[PDB]
Design a protein around this nucleic acid. Structure first.
Ligand SMILES: [Ca+2]
Ligand SMILES: [K+]
Ligand SMILES: [Zn+2]
Lengths: 117, 618, 341
DNA sequence: CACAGTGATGCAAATCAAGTGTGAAGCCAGACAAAAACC
DNA sequence: GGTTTTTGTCTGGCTTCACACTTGATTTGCATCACTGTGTAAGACAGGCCAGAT
DNA sequence: TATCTGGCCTGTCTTA
């Protein structure tokens, strides 16, 4: 974005308010009123010259039951938490290293007929 | 800056133009509708649309606020493919274009339709025969089988000049029944019977067979096949159940001669006249069929095992093919009837009083008499004794009448009477060939002027349908001087049109009871008219079909209840599908044409697939 | 050995592969028509005479006491010495194999028209199952006459036969069959020398011995280059059959055999391989105890015969063969030649 | 160097479906000011 | 220039969403194969033959 | 007499 003179004015006012009132949560609709009154010929010149610098910056910027691996994975999730993408890497390695997966595939075999029907 | 159109503006820009109306809307919602700006704008928009008669946009927005997904189940896509005659290659073009323009996969891709086909084709459903079928494999996953059935083809053997594909008969029947299951259940229900009732159902199957000419041979390597085909088909005609001491009509085919229900069983490229190749290919089909007469098919329908007994009726055969396969002589012979032993001369003198005596069983005996000559007779006496049965039958047919070819032959005959009544042959016996040609030319030109018929080389069903009317006799009378013969022609056609409905309607008893009642009476006066006022043509001779039509129509009607429904016209209509499917629904190569057409022709005949196209007509 | 083209009459369609020719006193006759007999010729048997390279097929009639045998393809045919012909097995137009046997004999020859007698011969004992592509010959031993029958093919037996392979064919067991026509009984012999089944071979019969040449074995699918001698002894007691292999045998199936002179025959035609026709011809010289097979000069075949995949023929009798090759199709289906010796 | 198919095959490519918390994008609020078109 | 309308910026936190990997299995996309049909009647010109013309 | 154009016939050639 590119910032107008009035906009730089508003940002500086917000900074002053935050340093004066650290524990204070500003309301938006009241702040625009008081800021607009402050804006409404010498105070503004600083902000006016600041705005063109911002313009230059803008130029630079312009240019189905689960797979047996899933069933195994889900149960081993808590242990890994005790030890997502990282968890899945660990799950896959240990599953690959493991008759070990015959029971999980049997559960999947019961589930496959149920999916089909 | 002239105000742009509202739709062009960016979100920020349209907000500023409507912020005045937006705040006004927030009031109305808090005041009247509980602060539901969403629901009050949705309703105002939907109502703005229908106000401008734009219901489709409103209705779709409704379906997308509800959010329900749109897609067609594969078996429904299949039905749309099969029944609108789209090819997979063409359907693929539609599917691809729909998915890319709507971003949604409304139609399914071809691999899933190809999977939905599997249910509908023979070999998918399990079954068993008690007792097991003789000489038939009990395997139940047999789909398309080679039609040569292991025919020897080594260069020593007889030369194999045909390609053929088929279904195993039983395996096909099973797939037909499973296709009909919903119509069998609904048929019990409407007869107030138990859905789960499983008693001995009985299936009556119409069997049809036909040769085609003008089947072009493809280029490319293969057997040098002849340019003809043969088709064996069956139509499921009715199913009754035995509930008490009643036979309850669970199902009867509404449209018995439609291509929709003539199911293909055997496609071969071969000549019906070539007996050696014909028996080689169809003998396996007949042996499967003989076995099924002696067994009961137990098959699982809706969770409950059911038993089916089968009756096979071969009636979809033209006379020429019937004579060929039941060892009879060719249609020129003196033994004109395939239903009785009468002689061409006898049929002209008596005309009407002849009963059905021939049968597949009798013909088999007579061939054996022919072959063995047990009274050591002369060939004349031998032939007289077996009444022309001098070859061994190989296919069992019902002794009946094909209404299609009957309708055609008879019209072809009348067309000839018309010519000879124009040359006044009743009065002048001798006429030159040139003098005869002009009689036909006169009548041809006149049928064009008065009836809008163009001349055709070979007689047509629709021509016959249109020619055999009293209005056409009117036309023809404008060319005959003598009104004594206007009378004769009018009567002859009145009698014929009193007779025709009997042998063409599905249920003469319900549809033309008085025509059925009077048939024996009407056929007598028809016969007498030919004998007296048409002596020149019908003294000492009669056409095969005039005989069949005058002498056997009533007995057939009481033995079977109908003639028209057992006609070939449905299987003939199937040929039209053969030609179309060979061009537009098959791989175009000699070693896949027959099977691709057979499988896709079966799908076209599936009632489960047809039902999806009457969904609109709930 | 001159090759000669032949023209044919209106009923050229009758002639098909598997047809048979029989010789009665120099008059040739034709049997085994395509399709069932028609009202033009009810017997299916034709006077087959070639006059100036034009062949006319004319119908012949049967005697009152005759059977009307069906047209048969690839039956075993034999000549019996009073001259008569034996037909055993073969295919009917309905593709059935007939187990029957028929005898063809001249009944009457008034005014150069022949009436035939066709009688069925009943056969009991060890009857050979219905067959085609098999040889049958008559041997003479010790003033006694005996019929020999060997090889061929049939369909699977009813127990194993299935509709899906309804037409599948297998070689018959290679049992030599003695068949005495006088009594109507048949005796079977199993021999160690004859282990494989064999069909479409040539059979030559001299005195008490029959030579088996070439043929094709379905299980092996080989056209073996073997010669088998089979001697039959007819003593007062039960006859004995002894077989001998004799190397130097021709390798050919479906070959045609003609007799040029007493004791010398020519073997022409047939197939060396499924796709290779046998263009050479062999000469057989017979000795009371010896058989001689000699290479002879090949005939001047035309480019049609050379490039045909299939050819079929039968022996006319006076050392002349009637050959046929598949012809152009719209015209006539087959092209016929006559080869003289 | 005609050309748009004709259906089944089989291999590549996409997709699925589960676990949760990152950041990114759009949005609201009042008031005022860039740009970009017209008298 | 004066005037009219499109597009914003200023802020904190609201939601919704896509993404983050891995594994095995489905589901889609796509090229491949040898072959299809639409090309599909009548006039020009020569040379032999014999009757009626020269 | 002794030829002699013309139709007539068939059959091939060229394009469809
Ligand atoms: Ca037909
Ligand atoms: K129709
Ligand atoms: Zn009759």
């Amino acid at each position: 974005g590119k910032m107008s003179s009035y906009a730089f004015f508003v940002q500086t006012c917000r900074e002053e308010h935050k340093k004066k009132h650290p524990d204070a949560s500003v309301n938006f609709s009241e702040f625009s009123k008081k800021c607009s009154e402050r804006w409404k010929a010498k105070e503004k010149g600083k902000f006016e010259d600041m705005a063109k610098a911002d313009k230059a910056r803008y130029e630079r910027e312009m240019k189905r039951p689960p797979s047996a691996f899933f069933l195994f994975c889900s149960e081993y999730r808590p242990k890994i938490k005790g030890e997502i993408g990282d968890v899945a890497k660990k799950l896959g390695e240990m599953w690959n290293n493991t008759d070990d997966k015959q029971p999980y595939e049997k559960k999947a075999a019961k589930l496959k007929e149920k999916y089909e029907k | 800056r002239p105000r742009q159109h509202l739709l062009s503006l960016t979100r920020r820009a349209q907000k500023h133009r409507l912020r005045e109306l937006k705040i006004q809307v927030k009031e109305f919602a808090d005041k009247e509708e509980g602060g539901d700006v969403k629901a009050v704008c949705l309703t105002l928009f939907l109502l703005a649309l229908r106000a401008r008669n734009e219901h489709r946009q409103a209705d779709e927005l409704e379906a997308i606020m509800q959010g329900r997904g749109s897609g067609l189940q594969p078996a429904v896509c299949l039905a749309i493919r099969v029944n609108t005659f789209l090819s997979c290659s063409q359907y693929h073009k539609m599917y691809r274009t729909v998915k890319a323009i709507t971003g949604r996969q409304i139609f399914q891709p071809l691999h899933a339709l190809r999977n939905a086909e599997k249910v509908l084709l023979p070999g998918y459903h399990p079954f068993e025969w008690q007792p097991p079928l003789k000489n038939v494999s009990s395997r139940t996953d047999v789909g398309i089988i080679d039609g040569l059935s292991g025919l020897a083809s080594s260069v020593d053997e007889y030369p194999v000049d045909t390609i053929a594909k088929r279904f195993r008969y039983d395996s096909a029947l099973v797939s037909a029944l499973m296709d009909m299951e919903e119509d069998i259940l609904e048929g019990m229900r409407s007869q107030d019977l138990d859905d789960y009732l499983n008693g001995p159902f009985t299936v009556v199957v119409k069997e049809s067979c036909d040769g085609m000419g003008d089947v072009s041979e493809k280029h490319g390597s293969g057997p040098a096949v002849p340019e003809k085909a043969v088709r064996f088909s069956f139509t499921v005609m009715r199913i009754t159940i035995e509930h008490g001491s009643q036979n309850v009509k669970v199902f009867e085919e509404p449209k018995p001669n439609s291509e929709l229900c003539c199911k293909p069983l055997c496609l071969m490229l071969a000549d019906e006249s070539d007996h050696e190749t014909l028996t080689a290919i169809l003998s396996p089909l007949i042996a499967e069929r003989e076995a099924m007469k002696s067994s009961e098919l137990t098959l699982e329908m809706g969770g409950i095992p059911r038993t089916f007994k089968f009756i096979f009726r071969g009636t979809g055969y033209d006379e020429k093919l019937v004579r060929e396969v039941e060892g009879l002589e060719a249609s020129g012979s003196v033994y004109i009837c395939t239903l009785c032993d009468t002689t061409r001369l006898e049929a002209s003198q008596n005309l009407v009083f002849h009963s059905i005596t021939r049968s597949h069983a009798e013909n088999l005996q007579r061939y054996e008499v022919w072959r063995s000559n047990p009274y050591h007779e002369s060939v004349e006496e031998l032939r007289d004794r077996v009444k022309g049965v001098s070859a061994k039958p190989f296919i069992e047919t019902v002794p009946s009448i094909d209404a299609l070819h009957c309708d055609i032959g008879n019209a072809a005959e009348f067309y000839k009477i018309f010519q000879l009544e124009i040359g006044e042959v009743y009065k002048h016996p001798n006429a030159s060939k040139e003098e005869r040609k002009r009689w036909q030319a006169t009548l041809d030109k006149h049928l064009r002027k008065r009836m809008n018929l163009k001349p055709i080389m070979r007689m047509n069903g629709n021509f016959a349908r249109k020619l055999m009317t009293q209005e056409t006799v009117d036309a023809v009378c404008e060319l005959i001087p003598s009104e004594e013969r206007h009378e004769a022609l009018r009567e002859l056609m009145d009698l014929y049109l009193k007779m025709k409905p009997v042998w063409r309607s599905s249920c003469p008893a319900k549809e033309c009871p008085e025509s059925l009642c009077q048939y024996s009476f009407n056929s007598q006066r028809f016969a007498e008219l030919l004998s007296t006022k048409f002596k020149y043509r019908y003294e000492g001779k009669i056409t095969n079909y005039f005989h069949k039509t005058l002498a056997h129509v009533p007995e057939i009607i009481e033995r079977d209840g109908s003639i028209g429904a057992w006609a070939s016209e449905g299987n003939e209509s199937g040929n039209k599908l053969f030609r179309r499917f060979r061009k537009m629904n098959a791989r175009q190569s000699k070693c896949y044409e027959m099977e691709d057409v057979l499988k896709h022709h079966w799908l076209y005949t599936s009632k489960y697939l047809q039902k999806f196209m009457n969904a609109h007509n709930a | 050995v001159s090759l000669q083209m032949v023209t044919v009459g209106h009923n050229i369609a009758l002639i098909q592969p598997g047809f048979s020719l029989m010789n009665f006193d120099g008059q040739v006759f034709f049997f085994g028509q395509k399709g069932w007999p028609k009202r033009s010729c009810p017997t299916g048997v034709f006077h087959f005479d070639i006059k100036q390279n034009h062949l006319k097929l004319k119908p012949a009639i049967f005697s009152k006491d005759s059977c009307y045998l069906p047209p048969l393809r690839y039956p075993a045919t034999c000549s019996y010495k009073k001259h008569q012909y034996i037909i055993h097995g073969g295919k009917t137009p309905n593709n059935e194999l007939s187990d029957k046997i028929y005898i063809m004999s001249v009944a009457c020859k008034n005014n150069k028209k022949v009436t035939f007698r066709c009688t069925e011969k009943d056969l009991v004992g060890d009857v050979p199952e219905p067959r085609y592509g098999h040889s049958i010959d008559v041997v003479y031993s010790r003033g006694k006459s005996m019929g020999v029958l060997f090889g061929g093919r049939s369909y699977m037996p009813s127990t194993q036969r299935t509709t899906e392979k309804w037409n599948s064919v297998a070689d018959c067991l290679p049992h030599v069959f003695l068949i005495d026509f006088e009594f109507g009984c048949a005796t079977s012999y199993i021999l160690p020398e004859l282990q494989d089944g064999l069909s479409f071979h040539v059979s030559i019969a001299r005195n008490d011995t029959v030579y088996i040449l070439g043929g094709h074995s379905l299980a092996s699918n080989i056209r073996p280059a073997n010669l088998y001698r089979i001697r039959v002894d007819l003593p007062l007691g039960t006859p004995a059959v002894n077989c001998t292999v004799l190397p130097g045998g021709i390798s050919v199936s479906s070959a045609i055999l003609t007799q040029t002179n007493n004791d010398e025959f020519v073997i022409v035609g047939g197939y060396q391989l499924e796709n290779q026709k046998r263009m050479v011809c062999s000469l057989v010289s017979l000795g009371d105890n010896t058989i001689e097979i000699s290479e002879m000069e090949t005939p001047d075949w035309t480019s049609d015969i050379k490039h045909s995949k299939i050819w079929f023929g039968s022996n006319m009798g006076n050392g002349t063969i009637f050959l046929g090759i598949p012809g152009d199709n719209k015209s006539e289906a087959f092209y016929f030649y006559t080869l003289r010796c």
